[model samples]
Target chain A: GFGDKFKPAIGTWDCDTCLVQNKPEAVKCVACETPKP
Target chain B: PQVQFKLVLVGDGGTGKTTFVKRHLTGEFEKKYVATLGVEVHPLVFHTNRGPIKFNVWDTAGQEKFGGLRDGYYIQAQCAIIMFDVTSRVTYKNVPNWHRDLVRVCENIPIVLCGNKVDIKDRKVKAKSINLQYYDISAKSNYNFEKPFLWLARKLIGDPNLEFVAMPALAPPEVVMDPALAAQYEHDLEVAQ
Candidate 1:
């Protein structure tokens, strides 16, 4: 996964609305259905 | 009137950023810290002489795996606290990286550097000539805990003498639902429709 090289320091994206962290490769937020930018 | 500001906490993992934020919000320290995901939003309300100042604190993940998600977290933030663990030299060394990345996304925001975990007996990182303002704090013991927030609040308001005064109770939050603004919002909604 080329994206792995650019991985965040430790975790995944947190949904600002739901406050849940998602997988690094996820294109959209799981809990609130918000798309990742 | 109540003024709101967005504040962020950034640092390397195991640097006690989460513990510090948790301490500030709950005034109690937990021995264990679960690493944050992308970011955790903690809203804090303070009643002061100038009025109520609301802080939307965004606690960002310190791991490189979440680097891509950090920019969005930093967006529109008015101030930040860049923290490092006094006991971990690597965490202290990475302070510049966090600062650089934060400033890259949100420039010109007031930032304060903090050295946490001062309660540890074997602290390797010393407070010295890093050429930036810094504070030594212990999130576990609640030592010098309020200074960072107070400092940022004063700096944001551009008042050196602004001090945090005791308020008997929390103020009722003000709303912005004027008829004119509602009409404008309706117009915009109709246009979208």
Candidate 2:
């Protein structure tokens, strides 16, 4: 429970993993090969 | 060819062994469930697309006092099924012990582990989380149990060719999915011996 009441939201089809906040609508994320900050 | 299968439902008393059998047989709820005594055998005839089949299901009492009595029935049994309540850790712990006894008496007989009361989530364990917790326990185990069963059946019955009707589950994978909320699914599933 690191982030309480924090439901992961989905990102756009272009984005890889769902967003931490308001993710579903966020623009497609860039693939950095490294972990996202 | 007609295939005769023996399925023995063994578990602690009040684990719903009788009720499980009744539902499968009558297709209706039993007004009341009576714990199986030393041993109770129920025969069912199932008609399948492949052919006609008969199942001789053996029910055993929860009390260990009847171990000898129950062992007598394992003779030539095709599969030994062990069930435990998802909410009871004690029952879950007893599975390996129960299975050991089955192997001792039956000598490598096919065994199926069933986590009953799967529909009850609040009072029970979560099936698919990292912990496994012996809680939800998952219908996946049930689905994966067949390969071993069929292998054992052929090994014991000495019938390489036989018709087997695999029973389907009433609950879907979604309900039993661990982290039921997770949309992603794990495809690699293998049961360890």
Candidate 3:
């Protein structure tokens, strides 16, 4: 369980433009407002 | 002809990787940062004496771990900047470790060691010897921000005397300066690697 501490969040999609993690269902990036496609 | 190079950015969290790259953002640079996830690629262009040069700067996440993936971010870096905070001893001590990870991936690439958060009067920098070019910078005051990039550009271009014909037009600073405040890995470092 040493490395398990660094597990990534599930059901998350990072914004393509800004790379900010956005929820799977979010329509747009909260950071840069880039529309999720 | 336009030239492009891959510049990888590696540092402990809060070492100001995002703050450094924010200088080149056209406008409204991180009015409120949401803590970028994984890695963000920024294409920065600068006009130099030779021609226009573009560096595809990769700003890796402060910590490690991206969808459980590992190590493709620095696969092909031609230049890099390993940042540490002048006020934080731990960040400075890990500079060598960051350097090791960088060279392990891409050998012989130009890498500059940056000590950020220099605006504060209370700072500690123990005397030490590092093979890489060292420059102290401050994201708040934006001091010597471009010097590291210039050094990398010259080294990448194989010209010791190269200079920017004109500095790129940066957006006006929207906030006040002189505010206070400001790594690991190998086996798991590969997560951020």
Instruction: Tell me the lDDT of model 1 at B155.
Output: 80
Off by over 4 Å in 1: A1-37, B26-37, B61-68, B129-132, B167-193
Candidate 3 deviation (Cα RMSD) = 13.1
Query: Against the true two-chain complex, what DockQ does each candidate achieve?
Result: 0.05, 0.01, 0.03
Instruction: Write the residue-wise lDDT of candidate 3 on B1-193 in tens digits.
Output: 1265667788887778788887776422433232333556776777778767777677765554223213556654678888988788888888888888888877989889988776656677633422388776776566666788889987876778888888765645543444333211112223433
Worst lDDT 10-window in candidate 2 chain B = B184-193
Give the per-residue lDDT digits (tens) of candidate 1, residues A1-37: 0122323345477655634356778686654456777
Relative to the unseen true structure, what is the Cα RMSD of model 2? Answer: 24.5
Per-candidate local distance difference test: 0.62, 0.45, 0.66
With a 3 Å backbone cut-off (N, CA, C), the pairs that clash in candidate 2 are A10-A24, B125-B135, B125-B136, B127-B136, B128-B178
Model 2 TM-score on chain A: 0.19
Off by more than 4 A, model 2 = A1-37, B26-37, B61-69, B128-193
Q: Which candidate gets the maximum DockQ versus the true structure?
A: 1
lDDT of 2 by residue, B1-193 (tens): 1255556667666555665655443322212122222445555444333444445566654454344443445554557667777666677677778777777776666666666655454434334421011222333323232333344444444556644564522223433444442222222111210
Docking class of 1: incorrect
